[PDB]
Design a binder for this molecule. Structure first.
Ligand code: NA
Length: 349
């Protein structure tokens, strides 16, 4: 039951989208007049409206996707918009498909993809989580940011063993502590115009924080883009160690804070293109000879749905694109298999 002022801003926003005949966003592509009319008066029980979904793509016509989720209910209430956009971004995940239940699988199956260290500089696996009961960034209140951060900081400061470490609130953070975290690439800052316009940076830095373990192989960001961004990383190619550490950590956190999960979409986050497993595994990897014939490399990468990015020579950031319609085990295994074949190729050239 959106109020009249919301609906008036929505009608303005739809006409802005309609006027931008060259706009290429998925918002513009899929927000048809009939979907728009169907959804524009709806409101979630936490007060979120279609405006809290689409405003960033209305303000930033040059968005690629142009929608965000303001709370968990929004994915169901505004499914007629989210569903085709998710299908377009994750090809083959249809509006009638169902993301499988969580399955980290047999974690002992994951290996060091580069034992002698000659290829993989470093390995990272991250996931995202929303805490059950809280809205997402566009709708969190200042009080909720504060309360969530107390819950999360207490949870992280209780981690033991390899995961033991230090929580740093962004509120009140000194310049020297900022520099210390920057030097480890652990700091985050306010987001750009796409996130500002999604109302995702309100009350900054309240409720935002950074945790890492003593070994600097585990990093958590609290209320950056999602409630929790949980990262496991280390030098070398032991994706198996990285993954098992991530799984241990996620399970330990879940004991204290339950996560938002959706039967069709998997783990729910603020970004609709990071649902499902929410998992991004990546390596920084030196493939000089395969760089001398990138058409082969893009061919192999494509059949593992790997994104190959340059980040120095033949050094690549290679990560998995898939999130939907596969398990955590399948996603990481597709990554592992992809890197193992790329390395087998490189050595034989
Ligand atoms: Na393949």
């Amino acid at each position: 039951a959106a109020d009249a002022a919301t609906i008036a801003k929505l009608e303005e926003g739809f006409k802005k989208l309609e006027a931008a005949t060259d706009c290429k966003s998925l918002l513009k592509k899929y927000l048809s007049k009939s979907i728009f009319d169907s959804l524009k008066a709806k409101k979630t029980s936490l007060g979120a409206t279609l405006l809290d979904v689409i405003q960033s793509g209305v303000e930033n016509l040059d968005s690629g996707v142009g929608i965000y989720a303001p709370d968990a209910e929004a994915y169901s209430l505004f499914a007629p918009l989210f569903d085709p956009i998710i299908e377009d971004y994750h090809k083959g995940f249809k509006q009638t498909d169902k993301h499988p239940n969580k399955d980290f699988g047999d974690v002992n199956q994951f290996v060091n993809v580069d034992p002698d260290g000659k290829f993989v500089i470093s390995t990272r696996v991250r996931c995202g989580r929303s805490l059950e009961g809280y809205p997402f960034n566009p709708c969190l209140t200042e009080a909720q940011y504060k309360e969530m951060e107390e819950k999360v900081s207490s949870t992280l400061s209780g981690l033991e063993g390899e995961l033991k470490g230090t929580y740093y609130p962004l509120a009140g953070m000194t310049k020297e502590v900022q520099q210390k975290l920057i030097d480890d690439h652990f700091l985050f800052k306010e987001g750009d115009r796409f996130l500002q316009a999604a109302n995702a940076c309100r009350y900054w830095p309240v409720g935002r924080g950074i945790y890492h373990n003593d070994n600097k192989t585990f990093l958590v960001w609290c209320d950056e883009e999602d409630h929790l961004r949980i990262i496991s990383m280390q030098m070398g190619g032991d994706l198996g160690q990285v993954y098992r550490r991530l799984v241990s950590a996620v399970n330990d956190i879940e004991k204290r804070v339950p996560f938002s999960h959706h039967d069709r979409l998997g783990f729910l986050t603020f970004c609709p293109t990071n649902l499902g497993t929410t998992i991004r595994a990546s390596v920084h990897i030196k493939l000089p000879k395969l760089a001398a014939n990138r058409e082969k490399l893009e061919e192999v990468a494509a059949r593992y749905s790997l994104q190959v990015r340059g980040t120095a020579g033949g050094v690549y950031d290679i990560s998995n694109k898939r999130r939907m319609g596969l398990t955590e085990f399948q996603a990481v295994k597709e990554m592992q298999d992809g890197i193992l074949e790329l390395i087998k190729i490189e050595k034989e050239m």
